[PDB]
Design a binder for this molecule. Sequence first.
Ligand SMILES: COc1ccc(CCN(C)CCC[C@](C#N)(c2ccc(OC)c(OC)c2)C(C)C)cc1OC
Ligand SMILES: Nc1ncnc2c1ncn2[C@@H]1O[C@H](COP(=O)(O)OP(=O)(O)OP(=O)(O)O)[C@@H](O)[C@H]1O
Ligand SMILES: Nc1ncnc2c1ncn2[C@@H]1O[C@H](COP(=O)(O)OP(=O)(O)OP(=O)(O)O)[C@@H](O)[C@H]1O
Ligand SMILES: [Mg+2]
Ligand SMILES: [Mg+2]
Length: 1156
Amino acid sequence: FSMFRYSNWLDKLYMVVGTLAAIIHGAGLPLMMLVFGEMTDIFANAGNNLEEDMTRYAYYYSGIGAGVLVAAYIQVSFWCLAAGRQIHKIRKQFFHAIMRQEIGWFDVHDVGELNTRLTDDVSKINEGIGDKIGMFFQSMATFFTGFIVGFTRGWKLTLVILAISPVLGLSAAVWAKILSSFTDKELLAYAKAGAVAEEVLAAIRTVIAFGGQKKELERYNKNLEEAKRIGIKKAITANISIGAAFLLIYASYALAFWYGTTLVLSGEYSIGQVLTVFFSVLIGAFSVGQASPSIEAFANARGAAYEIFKIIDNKPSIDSYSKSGHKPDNIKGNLEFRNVHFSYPSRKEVKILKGLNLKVQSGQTVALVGNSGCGKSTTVQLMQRLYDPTEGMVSVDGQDIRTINVRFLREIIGVVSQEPVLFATTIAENIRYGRENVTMDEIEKAVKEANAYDFIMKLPHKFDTLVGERGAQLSGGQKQRIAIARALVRNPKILLLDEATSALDTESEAVVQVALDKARKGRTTIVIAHRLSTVRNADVIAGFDDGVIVEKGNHDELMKEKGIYFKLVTMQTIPPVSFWRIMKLNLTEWPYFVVGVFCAIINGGLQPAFAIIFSKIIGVFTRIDDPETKRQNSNLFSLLFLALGIISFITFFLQGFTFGKAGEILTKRLRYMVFRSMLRQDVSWFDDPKNTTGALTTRLANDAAQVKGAIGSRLAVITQNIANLGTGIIISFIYGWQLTLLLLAIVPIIAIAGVVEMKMLSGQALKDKKELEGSGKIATEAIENFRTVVSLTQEQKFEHMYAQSLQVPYRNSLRKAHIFGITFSFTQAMMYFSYAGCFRFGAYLVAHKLMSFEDVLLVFSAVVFGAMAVGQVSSFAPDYAKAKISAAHIIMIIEKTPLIDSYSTEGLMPNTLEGNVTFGEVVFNYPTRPDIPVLQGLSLEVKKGQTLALVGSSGCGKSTVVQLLERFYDPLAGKVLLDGKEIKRLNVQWLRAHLGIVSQEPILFDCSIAENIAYGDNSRVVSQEEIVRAAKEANIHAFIESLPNKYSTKVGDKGTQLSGGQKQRIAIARALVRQPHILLLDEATSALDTESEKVVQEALDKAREGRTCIVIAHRLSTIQNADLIVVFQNGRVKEHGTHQQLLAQKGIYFSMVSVQ
Ligand SMILES: COc1ccc(CCN(C)CCC[C@](C#N)(c2ccc(OC)c(OC)c2)C(C)C)cc1OC
Ligand SMILES: Nc1ncnc2c1ncn2[C@@H]1O[C@H](COP(=O)(O)OP(=O)(O)OP(=O)(O)O)[C@@H](O)[C@H]1O
Ligand SMILES: Nc1ncnc2c1ncn2[C@@H]1O[C@H](COP(=O)(O)OP(=O)(O)OP(=O)(O)O)[C@@H](O)[C@H]1O
Ligand SMILES: [Mg+2]
Ligand SMILES: [Mg+2]
């Protein structure tokens, strides 16, 4: 698919113009470098009126700069405009094709997947075809023209440098590869801690219940230590990579200078040729290096566009836009289904359509009946030509549906949905979606007919009341009535309705049926319902039989047939922070920083040195003296580069280690704190949806690289850049003030250029995303509702709406492209103009003997290359912004304290528990929904060694009394006391330990069963004999013994490797491990291996002595086996007493007992 662009041949011309502009820019840059070589050559010749020659050279520079400006502007602007046009056209085509797809197609592919496809794949195509291609062409042109210039102006020096450059390229690529490998290794290493934390957090309730936080913390600490080791290895790898790159480039500089000095000293081509060839070839090498991102982006776009086109290329089986069918004018009611054989393509194996015979005459209110899953609604669905008949015949008025206008057919048949979908627009908007030619008079008549006026009239702008998100504005009965009105507005020839009002309420069903069946003489009707009333009104009713109709007759005929109809009838009855505070790594890295900065400063001083040293290697030739001594002097500088490069390397190496450790240590310590901080938190905190277990895990994981960068990387980059630029500026001022001042006041233009470019890129991205979302609202609202859309045959109208929503931001995109192109062209031409002005001024000074030409080169190179290196390093280190906000979030979380400090040693800790509990007036309001109280201040009490049972209502806090008993919260109002001990005053540790809570679905860590059982008895060692005794008590010791490896078996995740009953028994045994004085069990019986469940319940009862057990269950006999029972009614204790007294009374307990 090398040619994946297919739109607007004129756009092809625009793209070719952009390509030519890219070639021009690429050729231009080394052309500027060659002109620099010539200027240097003339400057050196002047070592003996020069100003004129300098002015001529400056004129050449200005011409090339203007050419560069125009060429870069053309490149970026033309490519971006072409991309905008291409993306607009392809997005329109893609949405239209999606609308064209078949119902089966949309069913097969996930709707969310396709919506995300539209949202993201097109944008990725744009990004990979927008401008990066222009950059690729420009880089290729720069490489080729650099080589051409090097060859033209030199043969030997060019050859040596071209033979050297691949070494540097290979070294850089190899270092990148090893860095990526180390990245993968570090990810895999930390995955262990990640899994540990995920398991712990997923079991936060049980984790806090068993007080095993310490063990999990220790394991996480060990994993974190391993991950820190690997991360430090990665950091040293990356830093040594950068150092090796610096060493290679400086070695290239040194060898180039040595060879060039050898040549020029030999009377060969002058120094200017050396400078031009060296710089041009080096720039070519770096550009061919920079080429890669464009290729990567284009490959990603290749893949995405391949998928998109494959979606587009698929010609559908049914083409709603195709008008190759016959469109009769007068439609006479006559429906024929003959041996309709077919199935759901989703699972073609089944055959729901097992052939069907049915003939309906005109003006018949036919109806279908049958058991759920008999395909009664599938017949109607096929009636709309939503699917195709695998083997059979379907026709209306004696003509095959396939041989008729698909769009016309679908618009000549009206349908009603059991759960109608309504377009998220005004009531008038919804009616228009139903049909635009309503004239608003028949619309009002239909609105009146459907009996939907109260909801419409009450709402603001009665006839134009909008529908909120997902139809929350109107009522379900209102929604059904609106749907019926919309269907009727089309005045179809065949109505197909299912569950008119059989979803939630029947009150509006009477009016709905009255209005629907009222006007059906000229509109044949198919009705699917689930109530006897709707069945009775049927005129001709057909019963379904395995996708076949056996019973066919009226109500009386069906009743006399004694079919399934009669069977049913009888059965029918972002806080901020301070950089000073954030530097917590002081406690750790204080011995580290002093090293790194010292190294970093040296590196900051390394680059400016290269300037002055380089300057001297030029100055040595500019001097008229030029004796043989220079041959020695050149060496004195040449080898320096080599040594200099080593220095450049060496510091980084050291800098890698120290800082690599400094950050790495933090990654450990911070984690070891934050996770702990998370554990020392109340259950309510986790209850917040924001603190989602997965989200908390990710934050615990995806923050090391953020905080490390914010603390260390930011400081290192700031010190390095500051040292480098300050050294350069100060040295320049020492050796020059005029050119120094001009350059210092000119560089900020470049700084503004770069900053504005980045800011414009970010802002344009955000704005484009915003407008794209504005259009995607319409797109998704017209994709998630695809079935009802095709039923409405309004696809074209939604296509026009999306076309408008895209035309709105298309112009904005084009204008943004133009603006970005102009800004980029200015940024690129600024450097050329600055070189022109700086060298013109340098001549204007040296001619007046104000500054040595060597001094001019010194100042220029120092300042400009310092700016370049500073920008590069700044763009190298991790971003401060995201790192800063991540540090803020983690600081907020770690510093945040709980309302109940489980680690607080103070608290009433009586030696022994009395087994007395009294919960009175305890009002429970969950922090998730504090406006929805769950406990109504119920009243209850249990004595020592007393077994109580609950009769709470569904989702009324029946089990919450254990939850509150678990101390996972605090009583909002009222009181709960244990053995006359203040629950608030009771130490959280002691209370949590002394209670044997049993959860409704007790989770277990995926480790050895021995550890899982042992972990319950925290704060002490539980001998294997105690574990065996507990397992026998829970009736699990025998099962474990039969299991190979006994208690050492690696229990599968969530206990999957073991039977659910086995897992519950293991959890009960663990609970019994702590020999709890007061215990709680919640829905532990269910059915649960009814024999095994009964055995477990019997064992628990046998071990109920010497402990008070609070039991919540759905088994009648277990509740009766309790010592006492407490009823619940909206959080109110209706009654409390024994089984006999409770049953005798008229209380809900008797009815519940009679239920089973
Ligand atoms: C990266 O793109 C460019 C590269 C070079 C140039 C101009 C001429 N260069 C020979 C000097 C600048 C590049 C420079 C060197 N040498 C350099 C850049 C990046 C580096 O990190 C990989 C580096 O150290 C290895 C050195 C100097 C900053 C010290 C302009 C550029 O902008 C287009
Ligand atoms: N996308 C689907 N792919 C496969 N089977 C499906 C799909 N949607 C529904 N089904 C099932 O296929 C059968 C089609 O039944 P259909 O609804 O058309 O008729 P019905 O007699 O009114 O039954 P029901 O209303 O209980 O589904 C049902 O068993 C339904 O659950
Ligand atoms: N952390 C929480 N935040 C908000 N609501 C909660 C929370 N935990 C439970 N609930 C709600 O409290 C009720 C659960 O209480 P409880 O389990 O004691 O009653 P239940 O009758 O045994 O429950 P179920 O009918 O679910 O088996 C449900 O409404 C549940 O939505
Ligand atoms: Mg159905
Ligand atoms: Mg419950």
